[PDB]
Amino acid sequence: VHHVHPLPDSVPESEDLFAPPPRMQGKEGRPKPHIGPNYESYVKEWAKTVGPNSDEWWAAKARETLDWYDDFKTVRAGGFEHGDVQWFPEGTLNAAYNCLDRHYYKNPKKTAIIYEADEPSESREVSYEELMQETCRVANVLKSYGVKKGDAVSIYLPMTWQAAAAFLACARIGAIHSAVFAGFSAESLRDRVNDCECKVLITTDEGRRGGKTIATKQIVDAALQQCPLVENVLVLRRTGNKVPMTEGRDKWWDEECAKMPAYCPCERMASEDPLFILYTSGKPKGVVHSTAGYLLGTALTLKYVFDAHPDDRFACMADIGWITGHSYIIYGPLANGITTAVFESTPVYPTPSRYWDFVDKWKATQLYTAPTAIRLLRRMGEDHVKNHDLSSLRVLGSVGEPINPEAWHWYNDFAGKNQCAIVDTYWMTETGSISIAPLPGAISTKPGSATFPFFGMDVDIIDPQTGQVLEGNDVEGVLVARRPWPSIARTVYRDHKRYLETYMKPYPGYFFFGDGAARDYDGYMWIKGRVDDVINVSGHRLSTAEVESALILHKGVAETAVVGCADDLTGQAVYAFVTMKPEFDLKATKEADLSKELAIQVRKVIGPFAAPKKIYLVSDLPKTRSGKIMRRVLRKIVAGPQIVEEVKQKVT
Numbered sequence: 001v002h003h004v005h006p007l008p009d010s011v012p013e014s015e016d017l018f019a020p021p022p023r024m025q026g027k028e029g030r031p032k033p034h035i036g037p038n039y040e041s042y043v044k045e046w047a048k049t050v051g052p053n054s055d056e057w058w059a060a061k062a063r064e065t066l067d068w069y070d071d072f073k074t075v076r077a078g079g080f081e082h083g084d085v086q087w088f089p090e091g092t093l094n095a096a097y098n099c100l101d102r103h104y105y106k107n108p109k110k111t112a113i114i115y116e117a118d119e120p121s122e123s124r125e126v127s128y129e130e131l132m133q134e135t136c137r138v139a140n141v142l143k144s145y146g147v148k149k150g151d152a153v154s155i156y157l158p159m160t161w162q163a164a165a166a167f168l169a170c171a172r173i174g175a176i177h178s179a180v181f182a183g184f185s186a187e188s189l190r191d192r193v194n195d196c197e198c199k200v201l202i203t204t205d206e207g208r209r210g211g212k213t214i215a216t217k218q219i220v221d222a223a224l225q226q227c228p229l230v231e232n233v234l235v236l237r238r239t240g241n242k243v244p245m246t247e248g249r250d251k252w253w254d255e256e257c258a259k260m261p262a263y264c265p266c267e268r269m270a271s272e273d274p275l276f277i278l279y280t281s282g283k284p285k286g287v288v289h290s291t292a293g294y295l296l297g298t299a300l301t302l303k304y305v306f307d308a309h310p311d312d313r314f315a316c317m318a319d320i321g322w323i324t325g326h327s328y329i330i331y332g333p334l335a336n337g338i339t340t341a342v343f344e345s346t347p348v349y350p351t352p353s354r355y356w357d358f359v360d361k362w363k364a365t366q367l368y369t370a371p372t373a374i375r376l377l378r379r380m381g382e383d384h385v386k387n388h389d390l391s392s393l394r395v396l397g398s399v400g401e402p403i404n405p406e407a408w409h410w411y412n413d414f415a416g417k418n419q420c421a422i423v424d425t426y427w428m429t430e431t432g433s434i435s436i437a438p439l440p441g442a443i444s445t446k447p448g449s450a451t452f453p454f455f456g457m458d459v460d461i462i463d464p465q466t467g468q469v470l471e472g473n474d475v476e477g478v479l480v481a482r483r484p485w486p487s488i489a490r491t492v493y494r495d496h497k498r499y500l501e502t503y504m505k506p507y508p509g510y511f512f513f514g515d516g517a518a519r520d521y522d523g524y525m526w527i528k529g530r531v532d533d534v535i536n537v538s539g540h541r542l543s544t545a546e547v548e549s550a551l552i553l554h555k556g557v558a559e560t561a562v563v564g565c566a567d568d569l570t571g572q573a574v575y576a577f578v579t580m581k582p583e584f585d586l587k588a589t590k591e592a593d594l595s596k597e598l599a600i601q602v603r604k605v606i607g608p609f610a611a612p613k614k615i616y617l618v619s620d621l622p623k624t625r626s627g628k629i630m631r632r633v634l635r636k637i638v639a640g641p642q643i644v645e646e647v648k649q650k651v652t
């Protein structure tokens with residue numbers, strides 16, 4: 001029938017298509033969608049945003065969405081080949097003016113940040129007025145340290161609301177902020193501090209996350225032992241517990257800010273001035289974004305992928321150390337002038353009901369999280385969500401990895417009660433903003449499909465064995481883009497050759513995401529996993545999401561990862577690392593029978609070749625702080641944080 005199949009699901013294809021629900025049709029007093037009600041309404045608007053006549057739309061959106069000090073004249077220029085991408089180059093603006101000042105001038109008492117503290121009872125709303133005053137104070141403090149336009153400033157802050165003020169204070173004066181996930185080791189912090197050559201660092205005395213203390217200042221003290229360029233450290237008093245402070249070098253955030261005025265002017269920034277550096281986990285890649293294209297891209301995707309409306313309370317549960325936090329906690333939502341959540345805790349603290357307690361307390365209208373969090377709460381059962389309201393939500397988003405249809409259905413049935421649109425949002429740090437996602441008022445969804453590309457995104461499928469584009473539908477290969485879009489990364493910091501070689505060289509003429517992808521018979525796009533994770537069994541090229549979505553169809557399975565290994569008879573062979581739910585009786589099911597049933601399930605939905613050669617039952621998989629599964633690690637172990645010793649021990 002079809003060359004390309006959906007990710008394995010227990011639900012039949014003919015009953016697995018989800019039209020926008022009533023909460024996304026302008027019924028029950030909910031806002032009418034910006035784009036709707038159907039696929040044709042998405043195509044009609046999307047077509048204006050790509051092709052040789054798309055400048056007019058982008059020019060209008062740029063002028064309508066952002067406040068400019070100087071207008072631009074050129075809409076776009078440059079290209080992939082040399083990495084000289086330009087958007088609105090003659091224009092000037094300020095990101096902090098667009099995220100704070102203009103909204104403060106309209107409604108200063110409107111809530112900018114819902115600060116959901118690690119302890120629920122310490123939460124509160126932070127108005128645009130308060131956020132802007134604190135941003136301006138910090139901006140004044142940085143100027144007193146001699147920080148100039150174009151200087152780098154490192155940020156090592158946990159998920160307290162002042163992290164937005166630190167970002168936006170750097171943006172306000174034209175400094176380039178480099179945020180580092182709070183909790184990274186002293187060595188990882190040091191490597192990123194030295195690479196951006198910053199002279200100022202911002203951090204807390206301590207962090208709080210899940211009832212546990214992050215010793216940020218002690219970590220900072222170990223790191224700066226090898227960072228000779230850092231002269232000033234601004235220390236936010238988050239807990240007030242005793243930490244070491246170095247005379248002269250270190251200062252308390254509150255005592256410095258109390259000396260400064262509560263307003264600070266905005267540096268007028270060129271469209272292409274660098275806004276930030278964001279390192280991704282070879283050596284750390286300093287991904288650089290400029291100002292206007294990135295801001296416009298986060299503003300537009302937030303408005304259209306989540307159907308944001310003025311009074312919305314947008315809840316992105318990620319961390320600001322991640323691009324997801326950059327684009328859909330701070331810049332995107334604050335640019336649109338709505339309320340945004342800064343969530344300091346974990347999904348299971350104090351109990352696995354926290355997400356849903358949070359939604360009903362604040363009456364959030366959109367929730368945006370990661371598959372790893374969705375599969376975690378699935379592992380915990382349905383009683384932490386069944387007895388909540390959750391009816392203020394209209395849209396639920398998933399980001400970071402392919403979402404298995406099992407998880408997609410749990411999300412849809414319990415978080416949304418079958419009344420929310422599910423937006424599977426595909427993008428990368430290097431894309432700046434969401435690349436492929438359903439528009440929730442228009443697109444009928446399929447579990448595990450990102451569906452259709454966003455405005456400005458013209459994507460295609462290349463057969464990696466020929467280097468040539470595959471025309472039509474029902475094709476599979478590697479995902480590429482044909483043209484720059486406004487928010488694409490502009491370089492890798494002081495390493496432009498790595499930028500060109502990684503993204504622009506593999507398929508000359510295109511941008512190479514690094515993900516395997518398929519376009520099915522309806523034109524829906526499926527992102528199936530990293531190209532490096534593809535497993536080649538006797539010609540059959542298997543993707544990680546494919547096999548993992550099959551394995552999770554078996555009862556008792558909480559999460560899985562599969563990697564390839566050298567096999568003489570099949571080229572490569574599939575090896576599966578399976579995580580079971582805690583209450584699964586492993587003594588009653590003889591493990592060899594479990595592994596046998598798992599092979600049968602994979603052979604049924606995928607084919608005989610896809611059955612794992614070996615299956616390792618483990619307690620947890622190696623994962624990053626954002627929740628990406630570390631298949632490279634498992635692949636290396638099967639070929640010769642504490643969860644890494646368990647994997648090596650179970651494989652020997």
Ligand SMILES: CCCOP(=O)(O)OC[C@H]1O[C@@H](n2cnc3c(N)ncnc32)[C@H](O)[C@@H]1O
Nearest residue numbers: 324399400401402424425426427428429527
């Ligand atoms: C955007 C937040 C994550 O940014 P990062 O730069 O950390 O990682 C990007 C990678 O995450 C995966 N990825 C992310 N989102 C999806 C997604 N929605 N579906 C399938 N794969 C995904 C894709 O493999 C991609 O190359």
